C-alpha cells in the first residue's frame, strides 16, 4: 500500500507560496522556534498570511520535548484566537507539537489517555475525523515529521505515541533558506536521521517498490552530500532537505524498525539523530546475521553506492560515522549509568511497536546484549 | 512540485481489496476490456462488490485507442444506471474512456471541444469539481493512466488531452495476476512506454527530485525485467507492473515531453506505445544536440544503467527496440501517405500543449525533420 496525503512544495523561496495556500482562511496560528524569530523568516511568514486577507497570531519559543503540559500552556490562548488554519515553522519538535495541539483543538473532548501507542500489546482507540488545515514547515533536514501521521508527545515525563492520518500535514513547504541556519552539529545530527529512516524503511517487512523508490534516492543523496553540507555548502543543504522528507514518505509508508526503537528508549542520553547513527551499524549486523530478507536487502543499497555485499554497506556506514566526528556511545554517557538501565531499556524497547515492522523480531535479551555491544564500542 | 492523489494498493490478489473499497456505495458499474471478461477477472470483481452489498453492472468490450464517439455509445448506458461508483479494469484504453465518462456524467453542460487541450495557445474552459469516485485497475503494464489526470481521446486521427486532477483516479488496485496474461507484443507496447514516460518526466523543465526518484526507478526496473517479462517470466510480469504506475507518477508530476506530442499527433499509425518507442531515440538525440541540461540528465540516467554518456543512453534505447522486434516506421505506413501528412503533423504537434514542458523549443520545421529522420531509420 502506498499513498501520501501531504502535498509538497518546494524551491529557493517556496516560502512565498504560503500566500496562495491562506486564500479563503480568516485566523492563522503558526507556532515557530525562536531561530525563525530571529533569522526573520518568520516576520516574512506573518507578512505572506497578512497579504493574503488572514489575521495572523505567533508563538515562538518552542521547547523540544513537547508534553501534554505545555500544550495546556497554549490552547486557551489558541481557543480564543480562533485558528481555522496551523502553520509550523521549525524543527521535527515544532512541528509534532503543532499537530497534537491540532488533536485537542479539533477533538477537545478526546481523553488523552484513550488514544496513545504506548504498547504494542495495547490498542488505543481511533481518532475521530479532525477539520483544520495544517502546514508544515521544516528548518532541519530533517525528521520526515512535514509528511508523517505521527507525533510523541509526554504527559509528565512518560513518552505516548499519537498516529493517525488525521494530523499527516496537508502541506509542506521546503524552503533550502531556512536549514542553510543549521549549526555543522544539528546540520550532521539530522542528516543522519536521514540516513537511518531511509535504511529502515527499506528493511522493513511491509516495504514497497514505491517507499523503496524515495528510500533509496534519500539514502544516495545523503551519502554523497552530507559531508558537504555539514561544511555549510548551500547547494548540499538544499539537496539534503528533499531528501529528508523522501525519507519522510518512505517511512510513512514503510515504517521504521529496531534502530529507532533503541534511539527512543535512549532518548535521555543524547539527541535522535545521533543515538541512531550510533545504534544502526550494530543493528545491522545483528539483522544481516538473522536474516537472509535483511542482508538481501542491504546488498541491494550497496550496489545502489556502487559497491556489492551487505558487510560493504555496514563498513561504510561506520566509516561515514567516524569521518563527521560522530562519537562512541562511551562518549556520551558514564559507564555507571548506562549499565545499570540497560535492562529496563530492553524491556521498553521489547514493547514499542517498531519492532513488530523490523525484519527479524528480537528477544529481550538480544536487545540487551546489542545495547551492551554499542556500548564497548565493539 | 509533487503530489498523490490516488491511494495505490498492490499485491498478488489485491483485487479482493476491492470489497472495503465499495462498502457504502450503493450502485457500481465496472467497465471493462474485453480480456478482463474472457479471463474471469470481470466475474471476480463483481462477486466481491456484491458481497459488499452493492448493486452492481459491468460492461465489457470496451475498444483500444478510443475516439470522442466512445463518449455517446456508452453515456446513455451510464446514465441510466446512474452509478456512485466507477471501476476501470482494463489497460490504459479503458482508463481513459472512463474517466471522460465521469466528466460528462458528473457535468453534463461540457463538451470535448471545449475542456480538451486542443491548441496550447488557447485556454480550454476548467472543468468544474466532479464527485463519482473512480477506481482504476489497470491491466497492461502500462499507460500509467490510473494516477494519472489526464484522458487521451482521438478526433480525426489525431491524440487530445483531458486535463484534471479532478480524474486522476481514487484509488488504484495493482494485482500483477492481470497483466500476466497480456500476450507478449501488448507486453512490450505498453513495457516502452513506460521506459519512454520515465525518460520524458526526467528531462522536461519542471522536474522535481521526487518525481526523478519515481522516473528513476521505473527505468531501471523496465531495462532489467522487461525482455523477461516479454517471454512470460511472472516475477518479471510483477516487477514491470509495479514500475508501470511508478513512471505515471513522476509524469503526473513532471509532465511528458515531445516524443508523446509526437506520437499524438501520429496516433493514426499505429499503437501509442510502439510508435513511442519509435520516436523516442530521435527525440532524445535531438534534446541531447540543443540542450545541454538534457545531455547531463541522459547521462545521469545512463550512469544509474552502469553505462557513462548521453550517447550511451540513445545507443541502448536502440538496441533494446531491435532486441524485442520494434518495426521500423517504414513497415508501418507507405512513404507517399506518411510524406503526405508530414507538415500537418509537425504543424499540430507545435500547437501540443507538452512541448511547453519539451528541454528545447522547437520550430515545425525541426519537428517535421524529427518525423522523416524517423521514417528514413536514420
Ligand atoms: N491517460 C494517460 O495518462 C495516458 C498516458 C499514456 C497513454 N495513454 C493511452 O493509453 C492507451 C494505451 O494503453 P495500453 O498500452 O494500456 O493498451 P490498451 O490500448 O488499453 O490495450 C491494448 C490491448 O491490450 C489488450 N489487453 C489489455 N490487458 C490485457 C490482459 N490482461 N490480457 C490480455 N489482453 C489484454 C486489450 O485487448 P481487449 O480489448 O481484447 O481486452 C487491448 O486490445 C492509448 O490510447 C494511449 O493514448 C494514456
Ligand atoms: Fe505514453
Excluded at 554523497?224 to 555539514?230: F, T, Y
Amino acid at each position: 500500500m502506498f499513498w501520501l496525503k501531504t502535498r509538497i512544495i518546494e524551491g529557493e523561496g517556496s516560502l512565498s507560496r504560503l500566500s496562495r495556500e491562506v486564500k479563503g482562511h480568516e485566523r492563522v496560528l503558526i507556532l515557530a522556534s525562536g531561530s525563525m524569530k530571529r533569522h526573520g523568516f518568520l516576520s516574512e511568514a506573518e507578512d505572506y498570511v497578512k497579504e493574503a486577507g488572514a489575521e495572523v497570531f505567533s508563538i515562538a519559543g518552542l521547547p523540544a520535548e513537547p508534553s501534554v503540559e505545555v500544550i495546556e500552556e497554549f490552547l486557551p490562548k489558541v481557543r480564543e484566537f480562533g485558528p481555522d488554519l496551523l502553520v509550523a515553522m521549525g524543527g521535527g519538535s515544532v512541528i509534532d507539537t503543532t499537530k497534537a495541539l491540532k488533536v485537542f483543538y479539533d477533538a477537545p473532548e478526546l481523553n488523552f489517555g484513550e488514544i496513545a501507542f504506548i504498547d504494542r500489546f495495547s490498542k488505543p482507540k481511533p481518532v475521530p475525523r479532525l477539520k483544520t488545515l495544517l502546514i508544515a514547515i521544516p528548518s532541519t533536514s530533517g525528521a520526515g515529521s512535514e509528511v508523517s501521521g505521527a507525533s510523541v508527545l509526554k504527559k509528565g515525563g512518560v513518552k505516548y505515541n499519537i498516529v493517525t492520518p488525521e494530523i499527516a500535514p496537508d502541506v509542506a513547504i521546503l524552503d533550502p533558506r531556512l536549514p542553510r541556519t543549521m549549526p555543522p552539529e544539528v546540520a550532521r545530527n539530522s542528516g543522519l536521521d536521514v540516513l537511518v529512516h531511509g535504511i529502515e524503511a527499506y528493511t522493513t517487512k511491509v516495504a514497497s517498490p514505491f517507499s523503496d523508490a524515495m528510500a533509496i534516492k534519500a539514502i544516495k543523496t545523503v551519502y554523497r552530500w552530507l559531508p558537504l553540507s555539514v561544511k555549510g555548502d548551500e547547494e548540499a543543504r538544499a539537496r539534503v532537505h528533499y531528501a529528508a522528507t523522501m525519507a519522510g514518505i518512505a517511512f510513512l509508508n514503510a515504517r521504521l524498525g529496531l534502530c529507532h526503537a533503541m534511539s527512543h528508549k535512549a532518548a535521555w542520553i543524547g539527541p535522535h539523530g545521533l543515538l541512531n547513527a550510533v545504534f544502526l551499524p550494530y543493528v545491522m549486523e545483528f539483522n544481516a546475521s538473522k536474516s537472509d530478507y535483511a542482508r538481501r536487502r542491504y546488498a541491494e543499497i550497496a550496489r545502489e553506492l556502487g559497491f556489492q555485499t551487505a558487510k560493504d554497506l555496514i563498513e561504510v556506514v561506520k566509516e561515514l560515522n567516524e569521518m563527521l566526528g560522530v562519537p562512541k556511545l562511551g562518549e556520551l554517557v558514564d559507564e555507571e549509568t548506562f549499565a545499570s538501565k540497560v535492562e529496563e531499556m530492553a524491556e521498553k524497547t521489547y514493547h514499542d511497536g517498531l519492532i513488530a515492522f523490523n525484519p527479524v523480531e528480537p528477544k529481550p535479551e538480544e536487545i540487551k546484549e546489542l545495547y551492551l555491544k554499542a556500548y564497548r564500542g565493539e
